[PDB]
Amino acid sequence: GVNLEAFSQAISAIQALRSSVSRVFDCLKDGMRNKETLEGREKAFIANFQDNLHSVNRDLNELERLSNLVGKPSENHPLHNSGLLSLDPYSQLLQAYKWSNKLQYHAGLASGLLNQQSLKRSANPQYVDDVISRIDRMFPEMSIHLSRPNGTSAMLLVTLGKVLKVIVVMRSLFIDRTIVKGYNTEDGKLDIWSKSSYQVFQKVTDHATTALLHYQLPQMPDVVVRSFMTWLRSYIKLFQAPCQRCGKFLQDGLPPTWRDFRTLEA
Amino acid sequence: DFDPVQRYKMLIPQLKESLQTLMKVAAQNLIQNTNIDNGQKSSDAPLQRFDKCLEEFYALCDQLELCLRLAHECLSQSCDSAKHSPTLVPSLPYPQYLAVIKAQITCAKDIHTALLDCANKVT
Amino acid sequence: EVNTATLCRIGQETVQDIVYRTMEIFQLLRNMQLPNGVTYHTGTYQDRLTKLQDHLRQLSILFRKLRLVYDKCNENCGGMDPIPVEQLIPYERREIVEVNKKLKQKNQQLKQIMDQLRNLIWDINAMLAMRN
Amino acid sequence: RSWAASIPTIHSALNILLLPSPTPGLVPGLAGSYLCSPLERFLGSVIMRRHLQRIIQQETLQLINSNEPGVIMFKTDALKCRVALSPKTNQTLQLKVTPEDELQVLEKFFETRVAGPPFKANTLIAFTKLLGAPTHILRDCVHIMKLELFPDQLKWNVQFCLTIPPSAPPIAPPGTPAVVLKSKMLFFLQLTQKTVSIIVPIIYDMATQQANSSVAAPMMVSNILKRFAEMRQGECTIFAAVRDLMAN
Structure with a gap:
């Protein structure tokens, strides 16, 4: 429901229109303080009209208009007002909603800025792994599956849009030893280790290994595998290469910083 | 029964035209005042009050602001209800929903009291 | 039984743990959704409630120990109180050194033992490479 | 004068009228359950006044004007349904x-508790329904004495005058039953709630209530209606004893 942001923007716009009206009528209530060469400050008056032209910005709200026109009479809210009149203590529900949203955003910002850790070091479960894999499989166009043909370690494969499927061996976490193979795969009777490529997919595997060694966290493997899955899914397009042309080399793929760009650019 | 979007759509052109009219009458009052003060009397005609113009402008502005704020509040209420409760109303048993809301309120109050005792122990 | 340098190191580790526990309590508060959301009615709810209760009790004990070690460091100012070597930073022990040498020798022996063990482990991994 | 003009306050008295x-x-x-605000109380009172005056002049009988508007003229003689100097x-x-x-x-205290903190305007239609002296002389008196007069679950007071109130389970919600001066008198006396809650269907067949819990409450109600010698009025005290004990 991003229309709330649009309505807040419209409120800010109309408040700015009122403020600009007040400001221009106040400026008209004063003359040239000290010009001594030309009363060019009257041009600021015209500039004030530009702020009044910002009223047309409120007309932009007509594009954001038609945000809500439905039934759903306030979404299951009325309990005491439209219900038991004696049930007056209702608003506690809305208070709790606001409290929870505030706590959520507060803790989110706190965790986001707490990246500057201060802990030096630490000095003085296959079912869980399969469950984490299945939970990560919950994203669209990211059909993954595992079989564990050899060993107690995890053998996971991912196929997003093309025949560029990737295999990643895990040890219940921090899945290292990545191998991407475009257009064949599981030869013999299980996953293979051919690692054949077109001198570019091998580079992609190198990038994946670099990320795995880079996105390795000291604990909490959930966030680790989540960042891993997002980093891999970011390859769904492979069609744009900023900071250079589209043919800087054999192929231009390296989104390590949440944005794809031309390869060989570190 | 008018809608917030409908009232906004019918108020915006009234607001614009009232702004135009008040600015025109303000310019007329200004040129009349200057002609009577700076130069000789030429605008031998009574002007307007000029106060009702911007007064009603600000009135319609306040009306628009508060109705848009009410609409925003309604959307926020719907969003928070959908987030804190599943969409089920006559489907869900109403007394069960009331009990679930009461338990949610009690749980939030307990979390708040725990954090408050934590802060007090920090003191 | 002075253990003063170890006490200062323990205080540093304790404030580091306080910071890490602050990070942890924030990371566990951010994922505290509505009670009757889907299924976490009271089980995981009360579970994390008790978890944060233990968190705050441990943090209070840690603050107690921090106050105690700070008071101990303050009262430790006995003899050579000024000690201006802070701004003047530069620009028997035999028995302890011998015990350290013997410990390092035993550590080198155990290191060779671990080297043999990991060689055998790599060999076993090689065998498994031959597996079907 | 008949209009305010820039009245000042000096200190935390503003917070006293607030908070x-x-x-x-x-x-x-x-x-008294909800924390009412003095300004909120004043505004709710005056808007209830305006609404009730509009409804009085709309359908029913009105009264002459005076310093404090009073249109509370009862059937025979009474007028107390407003807090002028609130x-x-x-x-x-x-x-x-x-x-x-x-x-x-x-009845006056009941109307006051109905107005109270204006959570809605249901008090308006509720007081508007208060127009039939029969079945509301002693029966309504007992209903008030049981509502908020500290009587002796345990006969929990329950009343409602909402517009399609979703609180009670919908079984056969009619259009708007307020009062019917006829054979089938429609009179939604109040709500029904003990410890859970249920609707309370009532249709006085005066020549009363002639209408899970809904599997046993109406059966017991009809059985008590057949044996109408329980201790004119439809059900004044028998309904209370049913809602206190028979509601189990």
């Missing part, structure tokens, strides 16, 4: 011709 407190002036202590006191003891004695004060 919604559950103390409605004298605070009789008989009721910040000072709700002082209105007009008259009475039949207990509907102390029963007039009971």
Whole structure:
């Protein structure tokens, strides 16, 4: 429901229109303080009209208009007002909603800025792994599956849009030893280790290994595998290469910083 | 029964035209005042009050602001209800929903009291 | 039984743990959704409630120990109180050194033992490479 | 004058008129649940006044004008349904011709608790329904004495006058039953709630209520109606004993 942001923007716009009206009528209530060469400050008056032209910005709200026109009479809210009149203590529900949203955003910002850790070091479960894999499989166009043909370690494969499927061996976490193979795969009777490529997919595997060694966290493997899955899914397009042309080399793929760009650019 | 979007759509052109009219009458009052003060009397005609113009402008502005704020509040209420409760109303048993809301309120109050005792122990 | 340098190191580790526990309590508060959301009615709810209760009790004990070690460091100012070597930073022990040498020798022996063990482990991994 | 003009306040007295407190002036202590604000109380009172005057002049009989607007002229003789000096006191003891004695004060306090903190305008339609002296002289008196007069689950007071109230489970919700001066008198006396809650269907077949819990409550109601010698009026005290004990 991003229309709330649009309505807040419209409120800010109309408040700015009122403020600009007040400001221009106040400026008209004063003359040239000290010009001594030309009363060019009257041009600021015209500039004030530009702020009044910002009223047309409120007309932009007509594009954001038609945000809500439905039934759903306030979404299951009325309990005491439209219900038991004696049930007056209702608003506690809305208070709790606001409290929870505030706590959520507060803790989110706190965790986001707490990246500057201060802990030096630490000095003085296959079912869980399969469950984490299945939970990560919950994203669209990211059909993954595992079989564990050899060993107690995890053998996971991912196929997003093309025949560029990737295999990643895990040890219940921090899945290292990545191998991407475009257009064949599981030869013999299980996953293979051919690692054949077109001198570019091998580079992609190198990038994946670099990320795995880079996105390795000291604990909490959930966030680790989540960042891993997002980093891999970011390859769904492979069609744009900023900071250079589209043919800087054999192929231009390296989104390590949440944005794809031309390869060989570190 | 008018809608917030409908009232906004019918108020915006009234607001614009009232702004135009008040600015025109303000310019007329200004040129009349200057002609009577700076130069000789030429605008031998009574002007307007000029106060009702911007007064009603600000009135319609306040009306628009508060109705848009009410609409925003309604959307926020719907969003928070959908987030804190599943969409089920006559489907869900109403007394069960009331009990679930009461338990949610009690749980939030307990979390708040725990954090408050934590802060007090920090003191 | 002075253990003063170890006490200062323990205080540093304790404030580091306080910071890490602050990070942890924030990371566990951010994922505290509505009670009757889907299924976490009271089980995981009360579970994390008790978890944060233990968190705050441990943090209070840690603050107690921090106050105690700070008071101990303050009262430790006995003899050579000024000690201006802070701004003047530069620009028997035999028995302890011998015990350290013997410990390092035993550590080198155990290191060779671990080297043999990991060689055998790599060999076993090689065998498994031959597996079907 | 008939209009305010820039009245000043000096100090935290503004916070006194603010800071919604559950103390409605004298605070009789008989009721009071929500923290009402003095400004909110004033505004709710005056808007209830305007609405009730509009409805009085709309359908029913009205009264002449005076300093404080009073259109509370009852059937025979009574007028106390408004708190004129709401910040000072709700002082209105007009008259009475039949207990509907102390029963007039009971009905007045009931209307006050119905208005109270204006969570809605249901109090308007509720007081509007208060137009039939029969079946509401002693029966309504007992209903008021049980509502908020500290009587002896355990007969929990339950009443409602909402527009399609979703609180009670919908079984056969009619259009708007307020009062019917006919054979099949429609009179939604109040709601029904004990410890859970249920609807309370009632249709006085005066030549009363002639209409899970809904599997046993209406059966017991009809059985008590057949044996109508339980201790004119439809069900004044028998309904209370049913809602206290038979509601199990």
